Amino acid sequence: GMTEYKLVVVGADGVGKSALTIQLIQNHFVDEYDPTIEDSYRKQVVIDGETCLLDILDTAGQEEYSAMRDQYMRTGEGFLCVFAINNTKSFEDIHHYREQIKRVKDSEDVPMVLVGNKCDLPSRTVDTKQAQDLARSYGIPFIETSAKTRQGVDDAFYTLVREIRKHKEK
Ligand SMILES: Cc1cc(N)nc(-c2c(Cl)cc3c(N4C[C@H]5CC[C@@H](C4)N5)nc(OC[C@@]45CCCN4C[C@H](F)C5)nc3c2F)c1C(F)(F)F
Ligand SMILES: Nc1nc2c(ncn2[C@@H]2O[C@H](COP(=O)(O)OP(=O)(O)O)[C@@H](O)[C@H]2O)c(=O)[nH]1
Ligand SMILES: [Mg+2]
């Protein structure tokens, strides 16, 4: 049997949620993906010898807090909170995503990774120390990624799976 891990990718428009997801699954950079499409993708992987199935929701669309939308998000076991290292506003929004996840999950201990995407670009408007400090304040890992080159992408998703696997053992 293989365990299935339900992962949700969140963050502002344009941070690279779709490119990160498509890069992880299909091993290629999709540069101008329709910003309005939300979809889910699966991939069979081996993490620390465990053959398992990832089910990843790439979020998009309207911000809305209906009971049905909350319940759908509540089925997520782990969350990647993504910002772009060249977009200060996307980094300022991270606290909001963390707050909504903690509310629907009814806990401060939710498997989560802070992802600083577009690390292939030299314009670091978001300070590295500030992002590391934010991740430290939540007790979660901070991983820099590039959906373009795949740098850090497997590490971000596999770290999240390791956090879920550990959370289920509590
Ligand atoms: C657990 C949970 C429950 C639940 N019901 N919904 C969510 C959720 C989702 Cl699914 C999408 C959001 C979203 N959109 C999806 C994509 C990205 C931007 C746009 C709209 N298209 N935007 C915002 O906030 C946007 C900002 C800017 C304007 C005012 N808001 C408040 C802050 F300033 C940030 N939050 C979002 C959000 F919270 C979540 C969670 F957290 F998991 F994502
Ligand atoms: N250079 C670079 N561009 C990226 C990267 N990830 C995404 N992009 C670009 O940033 C834009 C937004 O990406 P997208 O996947 O649509 O973001 P989403 O709105 O969060 O789904 C697109 O023009 C992508 O080509 C990355 O790691 N590096
Ligand atoms: Mg998208």
UniProtKB/Swiss-Prot annotation:
Glycans are attached at residue 36. The keyword Nucleotidyltransferase does not apply. The modification N-acetylmethionine is found at residue 2. One of its GO terms (molecular function) is GTPase activity. It comes from the Eukaryota. It is a lipid-anchor. Keywords: Acetylation, Cardiomyopathy, Cell membrane, Cytoplasm, Deafness, Disease variant, Ectodermal dysplasia, Glycoprotein, GTP-binding, Hydrolase, Intellectual disability, Isopeptide bond, Lipoprotein, Membrane, Methylation, Nucleotide-binding, Palmitate, Prenylation, Proto-oncogene, Ubl conjugation. Changing residue 35 to R: In CFC2; characterized by a defective GTPase-activating protein sensitivity and a strongly reduced interaction with effectors. The keyword Acetylation applies. It catalyses: GTP + H2O = GDP + phosphate + H(+). Changing residue 118 to N: In colorectal cancer samples; somatic mutation. PROSITE patterns: RAS. Acetylation at Lys-105 prevents interaction with guanine nucleotide exchange factors (GEFs). Lysine-depalmitoylation by SIRT2 promotes its localization to endomembranes in endocytic pathways. GO terms for biological process: actin cytoskeleton organization; cardiac muscle cell proliferation; cytokine-mediated signaling pathway; epithelial tube branching involved in lung morphogenesis; female pregnancy; forebrain astrocyte development; gene expression; glial cell proliferation. GO terms for cellular component: cytoplasm; cytoplasmic side of plasma membrane; cytosol; endoplasmic reticulum membrane; focal adhesion; Golgi membrane; membrane; mitochondrial outer membrane. Changing residue 20 to F: In OES; somatic mutation. A motif (Effector region) lies at residues 33-41. GTP binds at residues 11-19, 30-36, 60-61, 117-120. Belongs to the small GTPase superfamily. Ras family. It is linked to Leukemia, acute myelogenous: A subtype of acute leukemia, a cancer of the white blood cells. AML is a malignant disease of bone marrow characterized by maturational arrest of hematopoietic precursors at an early stage of development. Clonal expansion of myeloid blasts occurs in bone marrow, blood, and other tissue. Myelogenous leukemias develop from changes in cells that normally produce neutrophils, basophils, eosinophils and monocytes. Interacts with PHLPP. Interacts (active GTP-bound form preferentially) with RGS14. Interacts (when farnesylated) with PDE6D; this promotes dissociation from the cell membrane. Interacts with SOS1. Interacts (when farnesylated) with GPR31. Interacts with RAP1GDS1. Interacts (active GTP-bound form) with both SHOC2 and PP1c (all isoforms) to form a tertiary complex; SHOC2 and PP1c preferably bind M-Ras/MRAS, but they also bind K-Ras/KRAS, N-Ras/NRAS and H-Ras/HRAS. Interacts (GTP-bound form) with MAPKAP1/SIN1; inhibiting K-Ras/KRAS activity. Ras proteins bind GDP/GTP and possess intrinsic GTPase activity. Plays an important role in the regulation of cell proliferation. Plays a role in promoting oncogenic events by inducing transcriptional silencing of tumor suppressor genes (TSGs) in colorectal cancer (CRC) cells in a ZNF304-dependent manner. This is GTPase KRas. The gene is KRAS.
